């Protein structure tokens, strides 16, 4: 989509692996605001918005909190307290055509700066003076959308760049999107330090004869201590035997 008419995609009710985005070597710009580039697989959010637009190489730095610019004022504004990551890479081989590509437009003239996360798609003739335009272009009446005219022979700053903006928002509501931490292979009959979905502990994992209900995950003994657990990957009930200990 165009920069003035950027599309917004809602991402929820799925698992996301952000490690493949960092370890790809195809993105020219990879900077995260508020959070670290790493450790994104241990975070959970209620919803994620995905905004995409095409700009030139010089306007890439304009999408940042606390920064100004044409794009920042009249095309796409980020708040000062924005958290998330911005993805951008060169797209000269896909968005440029011989003789100039006019499919991408940008908003240039506006009375006031945009409020953060605003999408303006108005095609009203901009009134540059005290004389009304009445839908007729001319003196003091300029069309708000202009053509980029991308060409394959254009310089680095003039080459088209595809920019994807990731928005991270949280709320008291349950997190619908979460990241998958690596799960090592299960080991049996050894004193190991284990961790599961809700609890951590140290013990010996042995096969059980218990019959958990299909929805149950954890087991408890009489005096409020854990004795059995269900593996989150394999439907096997594993007893937690405490490791051998005693006084000397």
């Amino acid at each position, epitope marked *: 989509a165009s920069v003035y008419a950027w599309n917004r995609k809602r991402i929820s009710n799925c698992v996301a692996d952000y490690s493949v985005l960092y370890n790809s070597a195809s993105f020219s710009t990879f900077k995260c605001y508020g959070v670290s580039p790493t450790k994104l697989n241990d975070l959970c959010f209620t919803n994620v918005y995905a905004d995409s637009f095409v700009i030139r190489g010089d306007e890439v730095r304009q999408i940042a909190p606390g920064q100004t610019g044409k794009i920042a004022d009249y095309n796409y504004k980020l708040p000062d307290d924005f958290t998330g990551c911005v993805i951008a890479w060169n797209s000269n081989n896909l968005d440029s055509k011989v003789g100039g590509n006019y499919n991408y437009l940008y908003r240039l003239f506006r009375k006031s700066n945009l409020k953060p996360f605003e999408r303006d798609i108005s095609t009203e003739i901009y009134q540059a003076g005290s004389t009304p335009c009445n839908g007729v272009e001319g003196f003091n009446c300029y069309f708000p959308l202009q053509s980029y005219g991308f060409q394959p*022979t*254009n310089g680095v700053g003039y080459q088209p760049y595809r920019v994807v903006v990731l928005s991270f928002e949280l709320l008291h509501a349950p997190a619908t999107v979460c990241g998958p931490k690596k799960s090592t292979n299960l080991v049996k009959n050894k004193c190991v330090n284990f961790n599961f979905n809700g609890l951590t502990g140290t013990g010996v994992l042995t096969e059980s004869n218990k019959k958990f209900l299909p929805f149950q995950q954890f087991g408890r003994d009489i005096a409020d201590t854990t004795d059995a657990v269900r593996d989150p990957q394999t439907l096997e009930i594993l007893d937690i035997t405490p490791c051998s200990f005693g006084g000397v």
Partner: antibody
Amino acid sequence: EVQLVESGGGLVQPGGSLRLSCAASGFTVSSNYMSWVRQAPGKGLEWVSLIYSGGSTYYADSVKGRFTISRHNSKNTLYLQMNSLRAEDTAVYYCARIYGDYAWGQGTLVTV
Amino acid sequence: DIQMTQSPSSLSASVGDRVTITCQASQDISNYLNWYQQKPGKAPKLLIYDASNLETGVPSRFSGSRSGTDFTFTISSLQPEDIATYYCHQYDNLPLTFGGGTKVEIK
């Protein structure tokens, strides 16, 4: 109908300050891109600064920390405040419109 | 800063002669270039905007023809009242760049 008039030029010692004015008629200053462009004698034309319609301000690399642009709403006059003038800043300053048409004042003389 | 140099520095031509100058850019600009005419003692005047369109009030004898990265100005008929300094200024890049100037005289 449409005409840009400039005033405020004069002889200023180095290290001093000055303020220029650019009154407009026939159009709205705040809804259009304004710029201050100077021209030193004996050489070519040189851009200095621009201001956006929303209030964003930028300046040339030679005038970081020294030049200031502003605008008074009621009388529709564009101003350029400069501080700590140098010998190379002696130029004939103009106020113009960035896009859709080019409108030029009569010019004023600033000598340092 | 963008590198931009005009060529040639100065030339002389008679009335009605064919005058052709070129504007050289190190970085490729798609169509963002304007031409200006600075009379002696007077401000420059815009003639061609976006390097392909005629400004209202400008005579048709002035035209801009894109030649890849460089852009060339076209004068069909030179007149003694056309003595001015020629500038090409690239736009959409900060700092905005105005060239050294090209002087055309009447011989």
